[PDB]
Ligand binder design. Structure first.
Ligand SMILES: [Br-]
Ligand SMILES: [Br-]
Ligand SMILES: [Br-]
Ligand SMILES: [Br-]
Ligand SMILES: [Br-]
Ligand SMILES: [Br-]
Ligand SMILES: [Br-]
Ligand SMILES: [Br-]
Ligand SMILES: [Br-]
Ligand SMILES: [Br-]
Ligand SMILES: [Br-]
Ligand SMILES: [Br-]
Ligand SMILES: [Br-]
Ligand SMILES: [Br-]
Ligand SMILES: [Br-]
Ligand SMILES: [Br-]
Ligand code: NI
Length: 102
């Protein structure tokens, strides 16, 4: 079996019911972040071509996704933090334009 490295939270707080996260979170700069639910899975869609990522629970209202093979760093883990009607995507927040609001 794979060696273990503690790179996920061991004792995370549970998520809310998954319906709570679903919606279209607006942003003028990056365009909307669309969060949808299918067969137990939250997904994040970004851009005009609907580039889509599975959201994996991390801790509390924070999820992660893994970057695509088009990225400089495919498979790197990126945080998606939900708080009320906001979604913060750390990948897009370098100039503080990474909050999306539904
Ligand atoms: Br690990
Ligand atoms: Br923990
Ligand atoms: Br703990
Ligand atoms: Br919505
Ligand atoms: Br928008
Ligand atoms: Br929109
Ligand atoms: Br799915
Ligand atoms: Br796109
Ligand atoms: Br669409
Ligand atoms: Br994915
Ligand atoms: Br999960
Ligand atoms: Br979950
Ligand atoms: Br959180
Ligand atoms: Br990507
Ligand atoms: Br990583
Ligand atoms: Br990132
Ligand atoms: Ni082993």
């Amino acid at each position: 079996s794979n060696a273990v490295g503690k790179q996920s939270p061991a004792n995370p707080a549970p998520s809310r019911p998954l319906n709570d996260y679903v919606g279209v979170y607006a942003n003028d700069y990056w365009g909307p972040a669309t969060v949808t639910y299918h067969d137990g899975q939250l997904r994040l869609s970004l851009g005009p071509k609907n580039q889509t990522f599975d959201l994996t629970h991390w801790d509390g209202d924070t999820f992660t996704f893994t970057l695509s093979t088009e990225n400089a760093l495919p498979g790197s883990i990126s945080k998606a933090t939900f708080a009320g009607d906001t979604l913060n995507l750390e990948y897009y927040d370098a100039d503080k334009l990474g909050t999306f609001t539904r």
